Amino acid sequence: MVLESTMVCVDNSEYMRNGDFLPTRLQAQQDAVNIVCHSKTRSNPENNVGLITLANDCEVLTTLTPDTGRILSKLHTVQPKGKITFCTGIRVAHLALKHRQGKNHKMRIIAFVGSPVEDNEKDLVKLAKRLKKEKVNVDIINFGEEEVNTEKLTAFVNTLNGKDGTGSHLVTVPPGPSLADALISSPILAG
Amino acid sequence: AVQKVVVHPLVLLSVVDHFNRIGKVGNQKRVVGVLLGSWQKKVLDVSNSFAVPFDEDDKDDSVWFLDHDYLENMYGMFKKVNARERIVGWYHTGPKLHKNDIAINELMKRYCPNSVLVIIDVKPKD
Amino acid sequence: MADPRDKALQDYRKKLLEHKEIDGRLKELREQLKELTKQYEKSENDLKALQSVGQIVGEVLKQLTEEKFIVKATNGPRYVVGCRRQL
Amino acid sequence: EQDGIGEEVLKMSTEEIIQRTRLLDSEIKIMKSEVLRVTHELQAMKDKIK
Amino acid sequence: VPGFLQQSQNSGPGQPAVWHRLEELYTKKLWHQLTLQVLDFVQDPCFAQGDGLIKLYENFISEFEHRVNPLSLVEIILHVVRQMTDPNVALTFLEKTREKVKSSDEAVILCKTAIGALKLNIGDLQVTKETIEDVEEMLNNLPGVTSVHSRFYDLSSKYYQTIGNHASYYKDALRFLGCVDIKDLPVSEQQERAFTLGLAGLLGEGVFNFGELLMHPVLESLRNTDRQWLIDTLYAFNSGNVERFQTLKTAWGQQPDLAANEAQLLRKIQLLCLMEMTF
């Protein structure tokens, strides 16, 4: 019933082409896209969801549309062959959120991290204080093989919303047999 | 290998107005739009065009937006009112081209393979 | 009762009966999407086929100049005409 | 293929728990994401060419 | 299957820290840090005598593969088929590895060069031209690999040891010089490239020197110490003087493949002095 615009941010790098998440990590992260799009549609039939990729390019393959079946057609041939790029992936995610055709919706980004990040901590904390001035809740969800709980991601969660902020949760995964049940326990309803 | 392009004199004109539409708030100093055309021979022809919502930031100079969704449906309308017309490329203004133009061109070559961009000069006319 | 060679073997049957059940409707539904594209091809050919404003059939009587000719309709009057560009 | 059936006879979990694993991974995907994408192609085309 | 590498643990130096690390990474069922490290440990400088002790497991990797980059799969099987050192079955082995990755992945193009690299060794005329010609038919629609330009222009570099290849090799040894750019391989290979590049452009018919590749640093920055006479004589063609001293001092030094065409060298300078004195 609440009005927002959720922007999912998948990874199609090479590092999702391994099988600790048992069938395929693409098959893991696509089901994660399956449950967040059906969550944001059934909790509110008025919002809209678009996807953005981050590896090797930043493609806006679906624009921020209310129908989810376009997204699910574009999750096929996602071609996991890229190399992770992070610093432009959120600035290209936010300028999409300044293209809101309905300017009463809130601004929300979710992102899937299945590759190690290689970026300065000073760049992201400038982006963190940018999003503080820009009032965006980004929910970082960790997948894949992981430099587990970096200080850069953890402080970016803290410097997203400090001094009694929202609490945009840093979702951590145990690498092993799991569904999106840890993804839906706390953060998909209380973020 | 394209021989040459032919400027129908409605398209330029229809870049001047849309630069004047946003020109009350114009500080981006660039307007990207889609160049409709008629592929005849090795020589090329241009008949019509339209615009697209476009943003760009010099900070990190790779953060920008064509709208694929707006490019699908509005071109689909111009296809419906005129089956002769199709896409041949795109355009922008602000006579110094910018570093992003590799990214726009290599994106929308998946609409027409031998796509072509045309820079007009709205303010220089001398 | 953990694994006495049959709770093993009864599983492999009910897992593989379920996979071939769900792979079957996938092939049937993909075949139906292949069929409608053939129908959509004929519709877009018809949308292309909607601008044959005709052509007038005549015969050349004589040549006036390099780009002026004298033609006549099959039941109508005579005219002075030209060519397109590169005829 | 005698070893193909026969290794499912003397192994109790390797030839079964993985088959439990690779089905429940498939059935939550190859059922779900595949036929729902195909569902969101047919409803569009009937809202098309009609 | 883990004990397959427990018995072939040896001869890879620092055995416990790397081979027990190896049997960690595929028991995590990951396929990139696994893949990048086995490519590193074949690149590990030894004799690589355990190619047979790894080509069974790399075939085992290839059997339940279903995710791994076929580029790096062929990039590691070329080291395997190198260390086989038996060209009888190595042709049919590489055809088998080429036909089992038969998708649209563009490592098949450098399978064909690896076919030809062992085919410009034996049977050097009848179908070597075809396995050359098929590659630039396929060198299309994605010029951004540049390893497609690497392996094929190396295949035509081995085609230089035919009779009628002087200018086309010189045209193509520049193409390899322009596709791959940075130093990234020793001067002890680079100055030998520029030495045979200057000889191919000198014995070529239509070319005389075609300067400002003289300005290109892969010949002058690498042999400004030894064989300066080749840089000196290519300046003398660009100078347009006859200058009988240094244009014979190249023939005093370079005795093979230069005294057999010294009259053509005198033929070239007499037609080259005109087009600079009229300039």
Coordinates of N, CA and C in Angstrom, one line a residue, chain A residues 14-20 22-26 79-80 116 145, chain E residues 27-33 36 65-70 72 105:
Chain A
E14 N 31.4 -13.4 -14.1 CA 31.7 -14.8 -14.3 C 31.6 -15.5 -13.0
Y15 N 31.8 -14.9 -11.8 CA 31.8 -15.5 -10.5 C 30.5 -16.1 -10.1
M16 N 29.4 -16.0 -10.8 CA 28.2 -16.7 -10.6 C 28.1 -18.0 -11.4
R17 N 29.1 -18.4 -12.1 CA 29.2 -19.6 -12.8 C 29.8 -20.7 -12.0
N18 N 29.5 -20.8 -10.8 CA 30.0 -21.9 -9.9 C 28.9 -22.5 -9.1
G19 N 29.1 -23.7 -8.5 CA 28.0 -24.4 -7.9 C 28.1 -24.8 -6.4
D20 N 28.5 -23.8 -5.6 CA 28.3 -24.1 -4.1 C 26.8 -23.9 -3.7
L22 N 23.6 -24.7 -5.0 CA 23.7 -26.1 -5.5 C 23.4 -26.2 -7.1
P23 N 22.3 -25.7 -7.6 CA 22.1 -25.9 -9.1 C 23.0 -24.9 -9.9
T24 N 22.9 -23.6 -9.7 CA 23.6 -22.5 -10.4 C 23.3 -21.3 -9.6
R25 N 24.2 -20.4 -9.5 CA 24.0 -19.2 -8.7 C 23.1 -18.2 -9.4
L26 N 23.1 -18.2 -10.8 CA 22.1 -17.5 -11.6 C 20.7 -18.0 -11.2
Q79 N 23.7 -14.1 -19.6 CA 25.1 -14.3 -20.0 C 26.1 -13.9 -19.0
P80 N 26.3 -14.7 -18.0 CA 27.3 -14.4 -16.9 C 28.7 -14.4 -17.3
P116 N 33.5 -10.3 -5.3 CA 34.2 -9.4 -4.5 C 34.3 -8.0 -5.1
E145 N 30.3 -16.4 -3.7 CA 31.5 -16.3 -2.8 C 31.8 -14.9 -2.4
Chain E
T27 N 36.1 -29.1 -3.8 CA 35.2 -29.5 -2.8 C 34.3 -28.4 -2.3
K28 N 34.6 -27.2 -2.5 CA 33.6 -26.1 -2.4 C 32.8 -26.0 -3.7
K29 N 33.1 -26.8 -4.7 CA 32.4 -26.8 -6.0 C 32.4 -25.5 -6.7
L30 N 33.5 -24.7 -6.5 CA 33.6 -23.5 -7.2 C 34.5 -23.7 -8.5
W31 N 34.4 -22.8 -9.5 CA 34.9 -23.1 -10.8 C 35.7 -22.0 -11.4
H32 N 36.0 -21.0 -10.7 CA 36.8 -19.9 -11.2 C 38.2 -19.7 -10.5
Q33 N 38.2 -19.6 -9.2 CA 39.5 -19.7 -8.5 C 40.1 -21.1 -8.6
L36 N 41.3 -20.5 -12.4 CA 42.5 -19.6 -12.6 C 43.7 -20.1 -12.0
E65 N 31.6 -30.4 -16.4 CA 31.9 -28.9 -16.5 C 30.7 -28.0 -16.3
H66 N 29.9 -27.9 -17.4 CA 28.6 -27.2 -17.5 C 28.6 -25.7 -17.1
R67 N 29.7 -25.2 -16.6 CA 29.8 -23.8 -16.3 C 31.1 -23.1 -16.7
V68 N 32.2 -23.8 -16.9 CA 33.5 -23.1 -17.0 C 33.7 -22.5 -18.3
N69 N 34.4 -21.4 -18.4 CA 34.7 -20.6 -19.5 C 35.5 -21.5 -20.5
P70 N 34.9 -21.7 -21.7 CA 35.6 -22.6 -22.7 C 36.8 -21.9 -23.3
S72 N 39.3 -20.3 -21.5 CA 40.4 -20.8 -20.6 C 40.5 -22.3 -20.6
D105 N 30.9 -20.5 -28.9 CA 32.0 -19.8 -28.2 C 33.2 -19.7 -29.1

